[PDB]
Amino acid sequence: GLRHTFVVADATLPDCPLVYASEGFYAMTGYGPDEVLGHNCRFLQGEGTDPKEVQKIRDAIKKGEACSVRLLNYRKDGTPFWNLLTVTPIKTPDGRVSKFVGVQVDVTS
Ligand SMILES: *[C@@]12=NC3=[C]C([C])=C([C])[C]=C3N([C][C]([O])[C]([O])[C]([O])[C]OP([O])([O])=O)C1=NC(=O)[N]C2=O
Numbered sequence: 038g039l040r041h042t043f044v045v046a047d048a049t050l051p052d053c054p055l056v057y058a059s060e061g062f063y064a065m066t067g068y069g070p071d072e073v074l075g076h077n078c079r080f081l082q083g084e085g086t087d088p089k090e091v092q093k094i095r096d097a098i099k100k101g102e103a104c105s106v107r108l109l110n111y112r113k114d115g116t117p118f119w120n121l122l123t124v125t126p127i128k129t130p131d132g133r134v135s136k137f138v139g140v141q142v143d144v145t146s
Contacts, residue, residue, distance in 0.1 A: 039142065040061070040142070040143070041061070041140050041141065041142045042058070042059050042061040042062035042065050042140070042141045042142075043058070043059040043061070043062065043138070043139070043140055043141075044057065044058040044059070044062055044078065044138070044139045044141070045057040045058075045136055045137070045138055045139075046077075046078065046136060046137040046138070046139065047135075047136060048098075048126070048127075048134045048135055048136055048137055049135060049136075052077050053077055053078075053098060053137055054074075054075050054076055054077055055073055055074060055075070055076060055077070055078055056074065056075075056136075057074075058070065058073055058074070062141065065112075065118075065141070065143060066081060066110070066112050066113060067112045067113035067114055068080075068112075068113050072113075078139065079091075081108075081110040081111060081120070082108070082109075082110060082111070083109065083110070083111040083117065085109040085117065086108055086109050086110070087108070087109070090106045090107065090108055091106075091108070093106050094106055094122070094124060097124060097126075098124070098126075098137065101126045101128070101134045102126065103123070103124060103125045103126060104123070104124045105121070105122065105123040105124075106121075106122050107119065107120070107121050107122070107144070108120050108122055118143050118145050119143065119144050119145045120141050120142070120143060120144070121141070121142045121143075121144045122139060122140070122141055122142075123139065123140045124137055124138070124139050125137065125138045125139075
């Protein structure tokens with residue numbers, strides 16, 4: 038298949054911190070678990086990140102809906118790369134959102 042990464046966000050906490058990331062996620066971005074875990078994924082964002090696309094993710098999280106955007110992210114070394122992101126809400130049986138799962142694909146080609 039195509040190369041991709043994977044993270045899990047804990048919705049039971051208010052700002053959706055990351056609680057597990059795939060080895061590809063650390064290797065793609067250059068950040069380590071000690072600088073990724075516990076934090077919201079937005080640290081990957083930067084000057085060229087489109088605020089309208091960011092808005093689409095922020096609303097989907099509030100609304101508990103899946104979303105797919107294309108964002109300009111930045112590695113730890115500041116170099117940019119294009120990240121196609123799909124966020125999926127994971128619900129408990131009672132309809133409540135417990136976790137958000139994100140597949141990140143570098144589509145810089
Ligand atoms: C990020 N991946 C990512 C993965 C999950 C599971 C979730 C829930 C969010 C992301 N984001 C977005 C970020 O965490 C945040 O939700 C948005 O920026 C909108 O909220 P704010 O308050 O900051 O406007 C991801 N953002 C990225 O830029 N790159 C990803 O890989």
